[PDB]
């Protein structure tokens, strides 16, 4: 016969929305995908597709702390399949963190209450989607860099909730920018910086 097995199995995911893209583009062949947790009863999900991508979210979100393993079986199109395994995936430690967003902000006395949007995630506890903060808890610090337009030298403030109460100078322009950091991690620890935004 002749039907090529797979290569380039990549886990791609932001906020737990996980998809497995791979190669090569099917040349007169269909792939079927099997996903299991860490070493176990495999569960087929993407039946004899021709796409080189499989959205396995429903699976990974059942337990973001587990390390999933997967494989792609190559079946011959038209009138013992070959398979290649995916790398391990541990949702809680490798999903990229989507770019943050300052949700709003209004002065609370001699200070400026700043706030980050509590993003929603595919993670579903009970019949509910938990937020980013619902999933990570205190294991999610937001780093705010702010600085006054006037100068080039910045300032920083940390928070492990969603708002900051930063004092600022009376009648001055201050731009802001904030980054998400999961401290627990050893690799995808940070997100991209949220679009800078300024005051008056």
């Amino acid at each position: 016969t002749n039907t090529v097995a797979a290569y380039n199995l990549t886990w791609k995911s932001t906020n737990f929305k996980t998809i497995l893209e791979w190669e090569p583009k099917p040349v007169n062949q269909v792939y079927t995908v099997q996903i299991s947790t860490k070493s176990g009863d495999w569960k087929s999900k993407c039946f004899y597709t021709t796409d080189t991508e499989c959205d396995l979210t429903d699976e990974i979100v059942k337990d973001v702390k587990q390390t999933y393993l997967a494989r792609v079986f190559s079946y011959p199109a038209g009138n013992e399949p070959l398979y290649e395994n995916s790398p391990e995936f541990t949702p809680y430690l490798e999903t990229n963190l989507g770019q943050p967003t300052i949700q709003s902000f209004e002065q609370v006395g001699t200070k400026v209450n700043v706030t980050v949007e509590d993003e929603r995630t595919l993670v579903r506890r009970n019949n509910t989607f938990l937020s980013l903060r619902d999933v990570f808890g205190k294991d999610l610090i937001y780093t705010l860099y702010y600085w006054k337009s006037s100068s080039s030298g910045k300032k920083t403030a940390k928070t492990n909730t969603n708002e900051f109460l930063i004092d600022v100078d009376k009648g001055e322009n201050y731009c802001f920018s904030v980054q998400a950091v999961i401290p627990s991690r050893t690799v995808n620890r940070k997100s991209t910086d949220s679009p800078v935004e300024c005051m008056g």
Partner: antibody, heavy 117, light 108 residues
Amino acid sequence: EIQLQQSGAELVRPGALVKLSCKASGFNIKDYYMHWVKQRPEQGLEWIGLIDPENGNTIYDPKFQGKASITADTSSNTAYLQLSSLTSEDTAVYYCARDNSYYFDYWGQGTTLTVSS
Amino acid sequence: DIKMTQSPSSMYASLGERVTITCKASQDIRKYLNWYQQKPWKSPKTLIYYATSLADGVPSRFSGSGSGQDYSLTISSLESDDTATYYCLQHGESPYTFGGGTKLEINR
């Protein structure tokens, strides 16, 4: 596994400028915030400044602005700290640390800068 | 800008004794207080972080309490390798400030 390396010793002539370095090993500095902490003889620790190797941002204690400048080469996984307009008052030991957000969880051994002729 | 005030500068105590070093910040730091131990000729070690969490293999006799402006590290049963210098470092917002530190000398 993880580790930060520093020059150990360094004698410098007053007025000159110097660039201590701190090489990172077993972690990527673009995932953390590198710090620099000075410490003079009969005195306690003093924060110099930080740097976010990621989106090249740096923060400085007021007291050092102009006197210092933390730089990082994300290729060679190295953070820097260049002092300037040197006076005897710069003679101290420089540590570079690693901030995981909750605390400085790795310290390079110290560099012992001596400004003299 | 945001000052830390650690007390006492030095303090002699005997083994098995309990000791309390203290740090007061001039404004709610929101438990972004860390206690550091420095043995002579040694990079500092991180004893307690986030006001009350024990860290990287710290002995259970170390503990810290705090909220807002009041923070304190306490060693229950003082021992030999506690002769060191302790610093509190607030790292809630720039600039990051270490307190003045205190030197525990063991009485024996």
